[PDB]
Amino acid sequence: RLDVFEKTILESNDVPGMLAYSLKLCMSLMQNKQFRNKVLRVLVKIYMNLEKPDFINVCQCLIFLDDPQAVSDILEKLVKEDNLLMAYQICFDLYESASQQFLSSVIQNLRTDQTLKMIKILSGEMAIELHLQFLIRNNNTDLMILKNTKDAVRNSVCHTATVIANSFMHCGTTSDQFLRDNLEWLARATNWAKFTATASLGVIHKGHEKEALQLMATYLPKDTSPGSAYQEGGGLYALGLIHANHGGDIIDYLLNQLKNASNDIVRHGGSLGLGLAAMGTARQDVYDLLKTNLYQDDAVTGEAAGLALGLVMLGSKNAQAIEDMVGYAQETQHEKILRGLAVGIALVMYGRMEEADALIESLCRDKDPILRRSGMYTVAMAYCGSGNNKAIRRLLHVAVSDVNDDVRRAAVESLGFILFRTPEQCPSVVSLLSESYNPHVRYGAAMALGICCAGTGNKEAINLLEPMTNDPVNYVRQGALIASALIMIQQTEITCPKVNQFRQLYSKVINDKHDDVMAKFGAILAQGILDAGGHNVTISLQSRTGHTHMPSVVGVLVF
Amino acid sequence: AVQKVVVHPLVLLSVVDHFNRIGKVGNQKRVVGVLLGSWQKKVLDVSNSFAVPFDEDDKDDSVWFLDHDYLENMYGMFKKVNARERIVGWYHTGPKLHKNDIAINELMKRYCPNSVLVIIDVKPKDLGLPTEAYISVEEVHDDGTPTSKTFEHVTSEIGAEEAEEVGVEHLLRDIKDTTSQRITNQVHGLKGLNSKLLDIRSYLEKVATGKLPINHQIIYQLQDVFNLLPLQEFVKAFYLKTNDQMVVVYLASLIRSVVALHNLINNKIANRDAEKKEG
């Protein structure tokens, strides 16, 4: 109750920064949305009541209290008070940690020298291109591993995780090296190595926004000249890769490429690309043409429809996206189309934290482990952090008591999303989860170690994974591979002494030729994630600003 | 006269898929087809049968279509496959009946000397057992009018002639060998109770609007088997049960004290071992 609260924020002299760390500590013991926004909007106003104004308060209340008009008021204070140099917190946290839907609404509310730097902070391209400058200048390769993993290329991960490796190293190097060094290794292309051999250009060209079209001058949609549409569809997917979250007209131009009277041969990659491009912007036209993509009755573009429509309707609470995508779910005659629609209707409701309970109960009501798996993805996205036991009791019930291991796998992927905040207790619960009896859930426990403890300095997770790669199931050995790559991001040998052990050990187990290539399937990918950036970059599932970074969450859960 | 036949769920699945057929081809509602069987004895097997393309006109249920090329002709091709499961009867969906069932079964009576019609269930919602069989009967009355042939409840049960659950079991993915008693108890109770409710409502109808079958032929002897125990003063049975529960509690006491001692000794042994010999 705000009576003693108001007398003890209008109280007498201590450090006022008591209240500043008390913002995060009230947020640490917060249970509801009911006095969270109350305390959140009255501490910023008691900083407006104290004579010294504050900026960490608006840096936090823009991303927890979502007021696009109070930032317009103190941005008129940024134009009037004129100090851009104190303005950095609100300006580039508004660029950094803001929801893209809130970004569009806040550039709507804001525009009513900083006269144009008020638009230049919101576009915020300066950090993008000097980040790109870092991604071209810094490098540390290991090409001998690239050859001794290139020995086992197929229609497989090697053809994709070589470019994933030196493209997570280099998100936009704008330079060819795997195109340059060979063509016959590039000539193992069949529909997904074809899709990848034309999508990998935009894989290795993340960012670098203007030269997208004129760098894929070769990859306009009549300039491939191939006896197959995937070698021209993954290119427009690669345009969608480049045009992530900052389009302009090229969002509408991939939209028009889909609407240049072309059915399911351009859409092959271009629909994935378009949904990736207009992600969270809540458009109308992409929903209008993805309704006939939804009713294609062909899941090779229909899963692209479901996925891309969930992408363009991120956390929507639409009265027609939710209902008109759950409607097509039941009467379809496949269920990989239901994987597509599954992750789509998961992404359509993100972080609502009490709203989606009707949908979760309605979908876990049903009997389908794929549709209940959809419900577990959707409760991973509606709930992340809010362990109110509403999203734990029945979640854990269906997580570990159920009969089919795929919905159990999605539930142990949900655990890593609801347990980001305090990864201290997460070894004590996922080492318990380790004890599972079944292949998918052994692997899913490994994935819970991975996506839960991404940025941690845990050694017990490595201690878990070492018998998990001492396991006759080959892909739980790759679970150990990829999850340990996710424990060996961001950290060096001085952090834990198993880093270089596993670095040389993964090449050591790829020396064994008689292992499954499913056992070393993501071994090239474990090397690539093992140098994601080259330890230059890291995951952002919960940013240091205080607020979660939702397209990274999208990336990992669809990943 | 048949007390039971092998109700093999394979013919059940045939019935179900052809009910899906009659539902998806249009609006032909009452699933009706020919039941095939091999008369071993009063006992019989129903594992093979089929639906016949037939239609029933809305009025005059005595409307039917039994192609000889889809039955007699097929029978010869099926005769080279397996002569055992001979033409034995037929079936109909729809809960109570229609008017043609008797005429249909008597038409096919030439094929099987004891031909059967079966009220088949298209929606398993029953308290108990699905579709049952009704053979030709001559049961007119004490009046003894021209012999009615409304085929009486010729009891049977779900015969699983062979296991063949190599796949069937492989379909359940739900149950165990329930070492369940409570399930049986609630089912039995509520089923007796709803049955009795159907009874009392039927008899209130009998008093109110029920026909001459109000106490037709056995409803009074129905009440007589009720009159098996017509407080029933089971005092003989009371001290009988007193000694019975002497036995019951002797069992309980002795056996469960044995159980007590049993877990006690070795569970405590392992307990204390891992407890103090660990430190």
């Binding site: 640490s28 036991n389 009791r393 570990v400 008591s401 347990l419 207790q425 619960v429 318990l432 | -």
Partner: protein
């Protein structure tokens, strides 16, 4: 901090108690599975028990055993058999194709 540290003591005990709960229902589930296993232990078997004879054991519940068909074999045995009972060339009994020893019988012939 009495209005922070002390309060923070519940920030994790809730999930603690939830998992302490779930260990019970999973005890239940694993018990179900173990009963399933014990069921599948001996339901196909012991009906067409072919007879050979033990000859020599190599490792745990695995032995080279003289046949009565024409080919001695080195097969595994049901481990629950008392390890001090596979010493004689007594009337062992196995499956036809699997030739998996189920138990040994003392008498014969």
């Amino acid at each position: 901090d009495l209005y922070s540290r002390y309060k923070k003591l519940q920030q994790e005990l809730e999930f603690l108690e939830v998992q302490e709960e779930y260990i019970k229902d999973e005890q239940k589930n694993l018990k179900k599975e173990f009963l399933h296993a014990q069921e599948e232990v001996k339901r196909i078997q012991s009906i067409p028990l072919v007879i050979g004879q033990f000859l020599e054991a190599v490792d745990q519940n695995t032995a080279i055993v003289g046949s009565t068909t024409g080919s001695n074999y080195y097969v595994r045995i049901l481990s629950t058999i008392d390890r001090e009972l596979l010493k004689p060339n007594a009337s062992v009994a196995l499956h036809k194709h699997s030739n998996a020893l189920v138990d040994v019988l003392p008498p014969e012939a």
